[PDB]
Amino acid sequence: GMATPKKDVYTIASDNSFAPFEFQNDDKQFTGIDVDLLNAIAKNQGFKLKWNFIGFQAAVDSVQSGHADGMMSGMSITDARKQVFDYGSPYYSSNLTIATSSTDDSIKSWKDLKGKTLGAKNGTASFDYLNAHAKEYGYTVKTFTDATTMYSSLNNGSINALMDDEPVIKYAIKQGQKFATPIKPIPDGQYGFAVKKGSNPELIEMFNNGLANLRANGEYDKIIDKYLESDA
């Protein structure tokens, strides 16, 4: 239904370092998909916000304790989370996807992964997927303990490709990396805006109504495209 504010300002908790969703620019101001998108949603609906960029764990606990009204933080919607949060309509799909070098034209479909070296960060959803499909597609998996070493290996040619959460890859491309995403991604759920279960229902109404308007009026795509290599 139509959303009416019941607070002069709503407090939103978020991560302090989760690019491209929320991160600091060179001027030390917070920015990102979540920041621009929720700000644009509130503005569309005539709500006011105050952001607390405190970290994922801290943001969860702040909403649960009533010290924040909502959480916008690259948050994967899960059944475990639904036990204690209510979510707005999902605002972005999460995918696991393959990054190649943009200079390498040899990988055009999944069948071209035959004989390739694929990187993944140890213990991640990308790692689990790659391990589970290595025999089928015929690649070999090389594991990394952190993100920097993995992306360095793709750039120096010691892996042919890697799998990661798609926003990380598409943001690196937007930043200037010579990567591409030439093949089909693997759906892996959705991102959601959350309030404590049973709390601030009008803030969820705001969210859903504002989001629908931004999807229809083009601003939603403009915001995503600012941060993620768009296909268009």
Q: Is 212 in the site for Cl ion (CB under 5 A)?
A: no
Q: How far is the CB of 145 from a copy of itself (least distance, A)?
A: 6
Residues 6+ apart with CB under 8 A from 154: 99, 100, 101, 119, 161, 162, 179
Q: Is 215 annotated as a binding residue?
A: no
Q: What is the largest CA-CA distance in the chain?
A: 59
Q: Is 39 in the site for a copy of itself (CB under 8 A)?
A: no
Sheet holding 70-71, edge to edge: 49-53, 10-14, 70-71, 194-196, 85-87
Report the partner that residue 200 touches, choosing among a copy of itself, Mg ion, Cl ion, none (CB closer than 5 to 8 A by kind).
none
User: Contact, 47 vs 203, CB < 8 A?
Assistant: yes
Query: Which one of 3, 37, 38, 60 is in contact with a copy of itself (CB under 8 A)?
Result: 60
Burial of 64 from C-beta contacts in 10 A (0-12 / 13-18 / 19+): middle
Burial of 63 from C-beta contacts in 10 A (0-12 / 13-18 / 19+): buried
Q: Which is nearer to Mg ion, 125 or 228 (CB)?
A: 125
Question: What are the beta bridge partners of residue 64?
Answer: none
Q: How far is the CB of 209 from Cl ion (least distance, A)?
A: 5
Q: Is 15 annotated as a binding residue?
A: yes
Q: Is 62 in the site for a copy of itself (CB under 8 A)?
A: yes
Whole-number CA gyration radius for the chain:
19
Structure tokens at 16: 């302090």
The 57-76 contact track toward Cl ion, x by CB under 5 A, reads x--x----------------
Q: Is 81 annotated as a binding residue?
A: yes
Query: Which one of 31, 39, 52, 213 is in contact with a copy of itself (CB under 8 A)?
Result: 52
Query: Which one of 149, 158, 217, 230 is in contact with a copy of itself (CB under 8 A)?
Result: 149
Q: Considering only 41-49, 120-128, 197-205, 219-227, which stretch makes contact with Mg ion by CB under 5 A?
A: 120-128
- DSSP-based three-state secondary structure for 21: coil
Indicate the annotated binding residues for L-glutamine.
15, 73-74, 76, 81, 125, 165
Residues in the site for Mg ion, rule: CB under 5 A?
A: 125
Residues in the site for Cl ion, rule: CB under 5 A?
A: 55-57, 60, 209
